[PDB]
Design a protein around this ligand. Structure first.
Ligand code: GSH
Ligand code: GSH
Lengths: 218, 218
């Protein structure tokens, strides 16, 4: 019926992989976007949406009123029969999921820290071990789960996008990941989306983050 | 056939909710437990298990070779038809999941920090907002998803166990959560497990954590 609603800060943050999945699926959706100066506007609306666990992002479509970014992206995947056709494949996809989140949360965890520049050294020292596993995973695979796209592909894409801002050379040792990122960008729906006015380029985290914050790239 | 293997540090950490679920299900499993001084022993074995994304915990049963704690607990749930009977219920359970992880990771995220005692003030200031949602969730509900146990019940239980160590009064304002914790402890399988030699009481995080570390409680 009506367009489902994806609500979130006007930032990449937790919801960027979900946006990419929806666009890949060419699904109609509309967003409720909260701006940098709309914190009080959100807090005044937060507990008045029928949400069991009020938070950003939320996703409302007439069947569900969801929070939790990973519940939301998995629901959208589930509704298109992409979560896995059996327990073994579902676990495989949840494993891909978590491994990507080790990278993405690894960033988010330190981005608001006052000592970011110190913590970032540790994260960047450990990052190649995490990347290596995906590089190996993509040996003779088009996407993370073989010949067909799954939602962790867009999670990985988002993670790669973000860590490149932390160190533009961090993928130099990982040619298959560099190719993967280009391959996602070569999905016509995704190419179209990234060139559209719907695409949010910045910020990566909340505007007040030490890394990936501010109104514009450094 | 043979007992599945759950591999992890001899700590509560990421895998405690999974142990509780298995025991609730009265499932046979054996553990491969890595001790405080077995870091090199693990690193020598890490890449020799056929794991796609080598890590702790792992779970091996002859059908799967999994890493990622959330993939593992969901696989075990899935194998007992507990993940949800439709996309709406599956999303509900993933939402419960993520909300619990906001508490549990909220702890894990700061526990190894040098400035834990400062960061802990912020976390404990925000914690009541998170707890309030579960307190509300349990109004006239036996478990988080109604009349029947689901894996986020054991995740919440574990989260409550851990935050009580950070502040033994943090549940004083939340009687239904205090009751919930007692209700889980009153599941006979769980009561039996917590009294058994299989139960690991400490540490909460890795032994070297600032919070929830060491060989014994403070
Ligand atoms: N685990 C939650 C975390 C949500 C979260 O931390 N949201 C932040 C933005 S990244 C927020 O501003 N929430 C608004 C609020 O707390 O009211 C998720 O994955 O959605
Ligand atoms: N997201 C992963 C995190 C795993 C993780 O951080 N494991 C730590 C212990 S809590 C570890 O020691 N892994 C061993 C290794 O890196 O080889 C999960 O949920 O399993």
């Amino acid at each position: 019926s009506y367009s489902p609603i994806l609500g979130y800060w006007k930032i990449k943050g937790l919801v960027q992989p979900t946006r990419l999945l929806l666009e890949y699926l060419e699904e109609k959706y509309e967003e409720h976007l909260y701006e940098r100066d709309e914190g009080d506007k959100w807090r005044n609306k937060k507990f008045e949406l029928g949400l069991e666990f009020p938070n950003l992002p939320y996703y409302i479509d007439g069947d569900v009123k969801l929070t939790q970014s990973m519940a939301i992206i998995r629901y959208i995947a589930d509704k298109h029969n992409m979560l896995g056709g059996c327990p073994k494949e579902r676990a495989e996809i949840s494993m891909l999921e978590g491994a990507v989140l080790d990278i993405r949360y690894g960033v988010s965890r330190i981005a608001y820290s006052k000592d970011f520049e110190t913590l970032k050294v540790d994260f960047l020292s450990k990052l190649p071990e995490m990347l290596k596993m995906f590089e190996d995973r993509l040996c003779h695979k088009t996407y993370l789960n073989g010949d067909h796209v799954t939602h962790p592909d867009f999670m990985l894409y988002d993670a790669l996008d973000v860590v490149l801002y932390m160190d533009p050379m961090c993928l130099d040792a990982f040619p298959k990941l560099v190719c993967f990122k280009k391959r996602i960008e070569a999905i016509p729906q995704i190419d179209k989306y990234l060139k559209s006015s719907k695409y949010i380029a910045w910020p990566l985290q909340g505007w007040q983050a030490t890394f990936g914050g501010g109104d514009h790239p450094p």
